[PDB]
Design a protein around this ligand. Structure first.
Ligand SMILES: *C(=O)/C=C\c1ccc(O)cc1
Length: 125
């Protein structure tokens, strides 16, 4: 396992060194989005959480296609406020209920080290 803790204050530095193969080693789910909500990386442990297979969701829009539960002021609203501000660091609980058994999760959204990319981290609660 790659040793990184969910909610780590420097998680965006640690993950900056990580390819898709190492993202899959994470103890929690991890999705990289660009400013428009497009999935750039999506890890296996999120796959286990949501049941989505990863190679298939890369390049789809998270807010519009993949995850519609998140299209609301409480998820997507925050994400968009953050994109436009150029800074994002928020944690909250949420339920995923699209085409799946309702699963409660802790979400952490953080701006990445690189310019126009954002992390979504996810873990069971
Ligand atoms: C709720 O948002 C529904 C589904 C879903 C699918 C994949 C991921 O990563 C999160 C949520």
């Amino acid at each position: 396992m790659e040793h990184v803790a969910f909610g780590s204050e420097d998680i965006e530095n640690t993950l900056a060194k990580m390819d898709d193969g190492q993202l899959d080693g994470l103890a929690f789910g991890a999705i990289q989005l660009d400013g428009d909500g497009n999935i750039l990386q999506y890890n296996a442990a999120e796959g286990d959480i949501t049941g989505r297979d990863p190679k298939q969701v890369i390049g789809k829009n998270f807010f519009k296609d993949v995850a519609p539960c998140t299209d609301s002021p409480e998820f997507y609203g925050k994400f968009k406020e953050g994109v436009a501000s150029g800074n994002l660091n928020t944690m909250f609980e949420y339920t995923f209920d699209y085409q799946m058994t309702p699963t409660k999760v802790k979400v952490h959204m953080k701006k990445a080290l690189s310019g126009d990319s954002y992390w979504v981290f996810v873990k069971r609660v």
